[PDB]
């Protein structure tokens, strides 16, 4: 996260860390959507242009964390994956379209102050909230500059108009993404950066005061470059696949 601040304790209790076993290293962020499911970006797991193809045993999910590097004793829980589901039509060859994957935990995690799932959006929350100007919140332990934080970082970013997102890049944008960020003139900054992928973009409903996850940190060129924007998997557009996966397995 570039130009964000330290998180408060308990502030994002769904924030999950994707952790390589060997070498032990932060892979990606991710989110806790139930006691058994974690939602992340598919390019965290499988991205052939970089010879990236992780499996269940390559990976540990650490939940409850605040510190990036410490093992937080009595606070975090570390679990192993039982199964990994990548969207059948994730498009890594061209534009990372349908950048989404679900991971099944081998055993359910227990909730506490520091560990609590986020909500997934319904049609009319999505409609109400996914508007240009509306700010959502991205969190992660990735780089601070296009070096790395001690502690979870957070930043708040406005949704950007669809045409503005398209004229900011050569890459072909689809209905399964949206872009967030400040215009160069608005004189505020902020962006995800390496290591933040897979992370939750969330919004608080004013109607019921719950936190919903509308986006997955997906892709962007550079970090916090003027005139560029971050791009996020559009979680509602792909909830049908999510529901399926969850209530099939």
């Amino acid at each position: 996260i570039v130009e964000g601040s330290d998180a408060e304790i308990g502030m994002s209790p769904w924030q999950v860390m994707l952790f390589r076993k060997s070498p032990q290293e932060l892979l990606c962020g991710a989110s806790l959507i139930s006691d058994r499911w974690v939602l992340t970006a598919a390019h965290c797991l499988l991205y052939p242009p970089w010879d990236k193809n992780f499996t269940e045993n390559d990976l540990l999910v650490r939940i409850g964390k605040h510190s990036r590097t410490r093992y937080e004793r009595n606070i975090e829980k570390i679990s192993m994956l039982e199964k990994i589901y990548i969207h059948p039509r994730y498009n890594w060859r061209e534009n990372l379209d349908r950048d989404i994957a679900l991971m099944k935990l081998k055993k359910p995690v227990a909730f506490s102050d520091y560990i609590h799932p986020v909500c997934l959006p319904d049609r009319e929350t999505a409609a109400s909230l996914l508007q240009a100007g509306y700010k959502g919140r991205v969190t992660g332990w990735g780089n601070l500059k296009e070096g790395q934080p001690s502690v979870l970082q957070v930043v708040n970013l406005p949704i950007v108009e669809r045409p503005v997102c398209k004229d900011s890049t050569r890459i072909r944008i689809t209905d399964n993404m949206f872009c967030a960020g400040y215009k160069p003139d608005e004189g505020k900054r902020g962006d995800a950066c390496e290591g933040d992928s897979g992370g939750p973009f969330v919004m608080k409903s004013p109607f019921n005061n719950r936190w919903y996850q509308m986006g997955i940190v997906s892709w962007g060129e550079g970090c916090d470059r003027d005139g560029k924007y971050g791009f996020y998997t559009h979680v509602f557009r792909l909830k049908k696949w999510i529901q399926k996966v969850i209530d099939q397995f």
Binding site: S5, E8, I9, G10, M11, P13, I33, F111, S112, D113, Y114, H116, P117, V118, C119, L120, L129, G133, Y134, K135, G136, R137, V154, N156, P158, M203, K204, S205, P206, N209, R210, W211, Y212
Partner: peptide, 26 residues
């Protein structure tokens, strides 16, 4: 069913330091 309600904030009726920026934008 309890989703999106934070033990240490909404459940206690505590706001975090920046959530007002979000809501003020809606």
């Amino acid at each position: 069913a309890d989703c999106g309600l934070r033990p240490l904030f909404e459940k206690k009726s505590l706001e975090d330091k920046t959530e007002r920026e979000l809501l003020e934008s809606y």
